[PDB]
Write a protein that binds this ligand. Structure first.
Ligand SMILES: [Zn+2]
Ligand SMILES: [Zn+2]
Lengths: 278, 286, 771
């Protein structure tokens, strides 16, 4: 059943050079729109990084969350990698090709898991669709104009590999986005159930709060991530909006707030009308 | 006549240009969310009773593209009588490979007039690679994924003939639901999303006994000149059976079409869109 | 019977010319071919050759005066030895004579076969063996009389050791009389084999149509529609061979292409074996498109319609609307074959027939009647490898990975891919026998292996013209196929991973897809069926036999200097997926797919008289790419080269502005001249650079970034001095002395700057290097 669509708009700030490769004139190119030649952040590199951070978060808290989320009682912390048997006792239970991901095996279990209820599950005779839509982040109008003014939007950085004894240098190049860029993101949560959506928003903000202290794509451990979420507005888009079309959606106002001044700083305050209309 | 051109200004890639079977199923799922089951059965009774929607076609900045009729190829040497034969042959071959036409050149090919093909297709079919990363060891497993990436002003649109009370009651509230969910493809990666605008298209078409189909056909009687399209989608995880449609621009004579209802083991019955969208066409002798 | 003896007459009535040009007997070669078939019957030969001398003497109507001189010679001969009637043996000599005029389309100076692509050039007399000799048309030189006697010696040897039969004499006269001219004149471009192959075809169609000896004398068979031009064409080939998912690494693709050619031969040979026609009635059969001369009888139009009704219903059950065979026919007359006056009638009745093919492809399965009939079948399932949905449980676990559940028609092709190196052809037998791997629409096909005995009434034999281990009663049908393949360490076919690892530099997979340009205009120029039968064999032989000998490193005087990254190996890693008659789709190592496209182009430039062109798309792909995607990209890179100039190559994917003034594809002589200037100064051969540019790729990648400033705005001149500074501080002012100064004449002529075309030469070398 459909009740509305909580819509999350804002900006992604690449505080440090962000690299999301393609492997196809720089030797390691970041991906680009083929018609403009501008870089972008996909919706699939953003979502699998919000999920990979959140699955390790749940993996540490399997025992402490057995009675808020069921079907975390059927998982043991760890991977099923050594014993090559899927949907076993351990957590990261589905092998895709060579990688192990937590994907719950049935609809009846993915409605209880906090990962798969928010991010989706494949299953056999299951097909649990996700509840969030993560759009491709494109450069802000202010940064498309710097592309018009003749600037460089993607630098090229040279590293080197050096022997520990004889200091033989062995360099390579990596294209990465110029630090400081502003993207425009969009996440549209789908209010299916009217009870557990607060736990699905507060888990999505936790995945973003871990992303501001981890990296987004690329090399990262050598300092190629360092992302920052700059929220603009949260909107509700009620069920009455879609039938009659009149513009009475509920709009939160957060021009300059963080991902941690938004999770509990104003959570009782910013969602006051949304939690009232349900 | 006068049709209502529903434009779909994209906000990312698509998975494919939508056809009419996968627009009507998406309009069906959009109505059941905001209205319910009793209006979906009323929607299906409105399409059988009255006017029906067409397939989706590209545009590129006030150049509404439409499909090339298949009525031109048995005429395509009589269309080009007044040309010199060393350039008439390569004109005749590129005229046949063409898939779409402008809003103006469509009205010439309906009258067996000389026409020209467009120079540029408003999109591309790129192959973005994704990856599946292991959660402990970060091991990669590349698969490939293809898309439809539109240009700066380009988009996609479909047409609607019908009564206006059915449009703003059913088609118009459904297209704003679908602006925030997808039309096919990985909607969770932001694919099938768009912004909807409503305009007016008017097509000059010759009154005749024959007609071209601007949507998938699923004909009752055998058509005149056609082109087979063979696809069957998915419905709540249930795999639809493949159905011999007819592609757009194919020529029928006094055919209304008709939807086939399916079972698929669900609770509700699944209708598959196969109504035709007739625009009048002129033919040669077969 | 009169049936075989009429076809043997016209296939030997013109025989004797090679003994005129040699100088065995006194002249008027009709008298000579009588004595040559007389002397053949005596020593090591049956008496049937004596009766066949009547057809080689009483043609051209120079001897059969007032009809009575024929009778006094043949009254001595007894036709009761063969069951022939005194009047029925008189009947066939008249049929051969009218079929002799309805083929040439019409003597002094012995002239060698002239070239059908340019009549100003001519062919030296050769042996059709496809080995070590590319017949390139040179300047006109008359064949010596010493050289025609050696033609007679081998022909005397082969006719005594061959069975006197319609199918056993055709590869005899093909290997030896292909490059012998029929009528010696100024610019004869019709062969003697092909003139006899189309005299025997028209003589047999007259006999089935029921015209007698007084019908030929009265002029009644001409100006009356008694023949019938059959033509067929497979629609949907490119979405049948290549449209499979990421399974079956190229052993299976080479089996989809060999199974396409078996469906084409199963339909053609069924038309011949049911109307009573020999293989000479096939005008051509080249890449899923055939043409047959037959009779116009009610016992054949009815009998062809049952062949089309059965074959289309077979194609619809097996491959669900992915391959269609449009078969049509058109009644023609005697004068319709030849040029009558100033208008070409044969090219007009061919373009009436070609219009009926065009409107039949738009009615793609009209002859099913349950085509748009819906229905519900339980357990419908999709076979993973080739997008075909089957009833649940029909797919049988595969032989590759037994967890997967493929359709059973793909396990017949994986098993076929394991026997294509060890294969000498096929045998055509009934549907319901054992040993059959794949069935066609009318028959089942048993693979005739290397060491073994064939089975079937009709034996298809690949890439040779000698029936060695074949029974004497079995019908011999030769065909040809381009069948080069890189082997693995075993005796098989390599992989999309194995071909991609023997390439210099980056490990990509290279794909070319080409076809001859404006070829329909070339075959429309042919005005007579013997002239079409010559131009459609010679074009067929380049993409069947001589494209193998290009990969074999031959013909170095003809090819010359081509853009090569590495020097040419003894065994190229090339897998010819398909080569049809104009079209060819070849995959291999991306360094040798690049060189071969210039090596096929130069040889095709000289196999013709420089009149026909090619166009090649080239892609460089990941190994783990689905093959239906590597086809759909290179088919777009071919069509991008095809709507621009039709003598031009697409080399590498390239950035260019959308102003319409820049085109992505190079012309052949432009790129091959850009390589002789820019490559010997920066590239040394075998994946290494020159002196003073080693460890200086950072020059070259930034040189492409300066090329990107031309792409962002061609009107900005900022790229001109940045080139001069970057070449300057490295001391390389000698390298590239025209990328520093803007060409004003190019802005005058409205053609791009030389910084734009340098991308196709640099980016190949940067890919050649480790990068
Ligand atoms: Zn889960
Ligand atoms: Zn299959």
């Amino acid at each position: 059943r459909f009740y509305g669509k909580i819509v999350i708009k804002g900006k992604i700030k690449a505080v440090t050079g962000l690299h999301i490769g393609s492997q196809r004139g720089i030797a390691n190119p970041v991906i680009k729109d083929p018609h403009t030649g501008l870089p972008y952040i996909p919706g699939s590199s953003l979502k699998g990084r919000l999920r990979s951070l959140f699955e390790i978060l749940v993996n540490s808290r399997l025992g402490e969350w057995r009675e808020k989320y069921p079907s975390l009682a059927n998982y043991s912390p760890g991977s099923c990698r050594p014993d090559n048997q899927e949907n076993c006792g351990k957590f990261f239970n589905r092998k895709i090709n060579r990688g192990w991901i937590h994907v719950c095996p049935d609809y009846e279990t993915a409605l209880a898991c906090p990962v798969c209820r928010l991010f989706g599950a494949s299953g056999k005779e299951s097909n649990f669709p996700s509840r969030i839509i993560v759009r491709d982040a494109f450069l802000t109008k202010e940064w498309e104009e710097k592309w018009r003014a003749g600037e460089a939007i993607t630098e090229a950085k040279i590293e080197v590999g050096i022997d520990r004894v004889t200091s033989q240098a062995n360099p390579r190049t990596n294209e990465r986005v110029v630090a400081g860029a502003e993207f425009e993101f969009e996440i549209i949560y789908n209010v299916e159930n009217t009870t557990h959506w607060r736990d699905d928003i507060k888990n999505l903000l936790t995945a973003m709060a871990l992303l501001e202290d981890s990296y987004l794509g690329g090399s990262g451990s050598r300092g190629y991530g360092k992302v920052k979420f700059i929220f603009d507005s949260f909107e509700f888009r009620p069920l009455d909006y879609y039938r009659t079309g009149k513009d009475e959606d509920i709009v939160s106002i957060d021009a300059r707030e963080k991902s941690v001044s938004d999770i509990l700083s104003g959570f009782d305050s910013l969602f006051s009308e949304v939690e009232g209309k349900l | 006549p006068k049709f209502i051109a529903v434009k779909l200004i994209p906000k990312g890639p698509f998975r494919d240009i939508p056809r009419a079977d996968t627009l009507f199923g998406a309009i069906g799922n959009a109505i059941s969310a905001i209205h319910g089951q009793s209006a979906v059965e009323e929607l299906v009774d409105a399409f059988v009773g009255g006017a029906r929607i067409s397939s989706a076609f590209p545009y590129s900045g006030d150049t509404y593209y439409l499909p090339k009729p298949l009525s031109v190829e048995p005429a395509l040497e009589g269309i080009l009588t007044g040309l010199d034969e060393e350039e008439r042959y390569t004109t005749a071959k590129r005229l046949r490979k063409a898939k779409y036409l402008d809003l103006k050149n469509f009205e010439l090919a309906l009258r067996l007039r000389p026409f020209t093909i467009p120079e540029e297709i408003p999109y591309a079919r790129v192959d973005v690679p994704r990856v599946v990363l292991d959660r402990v060891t970060q091991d990669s497993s590349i698969y490939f994924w293809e898309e439809i990436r539109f240009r700066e002003k380009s988009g996609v649109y479909f047409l609607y003939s019908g009564p206006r009370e059915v449009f703003d009651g059913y088609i118009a509230p459904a297209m704003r639901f679908l602006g925030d969910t997808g039309i096919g493809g990985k909607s969770t990666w932001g694919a099938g999303l768009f912004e909807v605008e409503f305009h007016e298209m008017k097509i000059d078409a010759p009154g005749s006994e024959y007609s071209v189909t601007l949507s998938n056909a699923l004909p009752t009687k055998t058509p005149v000149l056609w082109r087979l399209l063979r696809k069957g989608g998915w419905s709540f995880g249930r795999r639809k059976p493949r159905m011999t449609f007819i592609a757009e621009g194919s020529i029928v004579k006094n055919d209304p079409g008709g939807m086939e209802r399916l079972e698929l083991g669900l609770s509700h019955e699944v209708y598959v869109y196969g109504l035709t969208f007739p625009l009048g066409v002129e033919l040669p002798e077969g | 019977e009169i049936d075989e003896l009429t076809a043997l007459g016209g296939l030997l009535a013109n025989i004797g010319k090679p003994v005129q040009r040699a100088g065995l007997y006194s002249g008027d070669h009709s008298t000579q071919g009588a004595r040559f078939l007389r002397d053949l019957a005596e020593n090591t030969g049956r008496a049937e050759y004596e009766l066949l001398s009547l057809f080689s003497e009483f043609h051209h109507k120079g001897h059969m005066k007032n009809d009575e001189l024929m009778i006094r010679r043949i009254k001595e001969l007894s036709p009761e030895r063969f069951g022939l009637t005194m009047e029925d043996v008189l009947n066939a000599l008249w049929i051969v004579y009218e079929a002799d005029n309805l083929a040439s389309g019409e003597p002094q100076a012995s002239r060698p076969l002239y070239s059908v692509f340019n009549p100003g050039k001519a062919y030296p007399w050769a042996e059709l063996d496809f080995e070590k000799e590319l017949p390139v048309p040179g300047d006109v030189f008359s064949i010596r009389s010493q050289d025609y006697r050696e033609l007679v010696k081998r022909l005397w040897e082969e006719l005594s050791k061959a069975k006197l039969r319609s199918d056993r004499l055709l590869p005899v006269l093909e290997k030896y009389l292909t490059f012998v001219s029929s009528v010696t004149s100024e610019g004869n471009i019709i062969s003697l084999y092909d003139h006899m192959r189309m005299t025997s075809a028209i003589a047999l169609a007259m006999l089935r149509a029921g015209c007698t000896a007084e019908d030929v004398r009265s002029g009644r068979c001409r100006k009356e529609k008694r023949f019938l031009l059959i033509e067929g064409d497979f629609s949907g080939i490119q979405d049948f061979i290549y449209r499979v998912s990421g399974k079956g690494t190229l052993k299976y693709l080479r089996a989809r292409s060999a199974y396409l050619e078996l469906i084409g031969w199963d339909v053609v040979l069924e038309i011949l074996s049911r109307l009573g026609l020999t293989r000479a009635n096939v005008v051509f059969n080249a890449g899923g498109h055939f043409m047959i001369i037959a009779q116009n009888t009610p016992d054949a139009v009815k009998e062809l319609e049952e062949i089309r009704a059965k074959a289309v219903e077979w194609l619809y059950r097996e491959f669900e609307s992915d391959l269609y065979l449009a078969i049509e026919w058109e009644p023609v007359s005697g004068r319709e074959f030849g040029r009558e006056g100033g208008k070409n009638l044969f090219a007009e009745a061919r373009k009436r027939l070609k219009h009926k093919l065009t409107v039949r492809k738009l009615k793609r399965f009209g002859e099913i009647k349950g085509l748009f009939e819906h229905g519900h079948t339980e357990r419908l399932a999709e076979c993973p490898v080739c997008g075909r949905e089957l009833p649940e449980g029909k797919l049988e676990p595969s032989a590759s990975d037994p967890e997967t559940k493929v359709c059973p028609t793909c396990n017949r092709l994986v098993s076929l891919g394991g026997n294509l190196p060890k294969l000498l052809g096929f045998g055509r037998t009934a549907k319901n026998d054992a040993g059959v791997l794949v069935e066609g629409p009318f028959s089942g096909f048993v693979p005739y292996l290397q060491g073994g005995r064939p089975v079937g009434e009709q034996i298809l034999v690949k890439n040779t013209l000698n029936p060695g281990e074949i029974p004497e009663s079995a019908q011999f049908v030769p065909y040809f196929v381009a069948d080069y393949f890189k082997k693995d360490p075993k005796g098989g076919v390599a992989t999309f991973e194995e071909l991609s690892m023997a390439s210099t530099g980056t490990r990509r997979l290279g794909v070319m897809k080409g076809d001859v340009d404006r070829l329909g205009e070339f075959f429309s120029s042919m005005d007579s069926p013997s002239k079409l039968a010559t131009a459609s064999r010679f074009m067929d032989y380049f993409f069947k036999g001589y494209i193998g000998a290009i990969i074999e490193g031959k013909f170095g005087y003809i090819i010359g200097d081509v853009p090569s990254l590495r020097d040419w190996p003894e065994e190229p890693d090339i897998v010819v997926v398909y080569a049809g008659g104009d079209d060819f789709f070849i995959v291999g190592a991306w360094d040798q797919i690049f060189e071969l496209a210039f090596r096929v182009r130069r040889a095709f430039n000289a196999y013709t008289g420089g009149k026909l062109t090619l166009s090649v798309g080239l892609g460089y792909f990941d190994e783990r790419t689905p093959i239906y995607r590597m086809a759909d990209v290179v088919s777009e890179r071919l069509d991008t080269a095809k709507d621009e100039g039709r003598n031009r190559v697409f080399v590498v994917g390239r950035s260019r502005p959308l102003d319409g003034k820049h085109k992505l594809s190079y012309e052949w002589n432009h790129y091959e001249e850009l390589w002789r200037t820019y490559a010997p100064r920066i590239y040394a051969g075998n994946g290494r650079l020159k002196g003073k540019l080693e460890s200086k790729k950072g020059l070259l990648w930034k040189l492409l970034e300066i090329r990107e400033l031309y792409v962002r705005d061609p009107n900005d001149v900022r790229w001109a001095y940045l080139t001069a500074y970057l070449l300057g501080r490295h001391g390389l002012s000698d390298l590239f002395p025209e990328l520093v100064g803007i060409d004003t004449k190019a802005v005058e002529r409205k053609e791009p700057q030389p910084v734009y075309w340098v991308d196709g030469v640099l980016k190949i070398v940067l890919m050649a290097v480790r990068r």
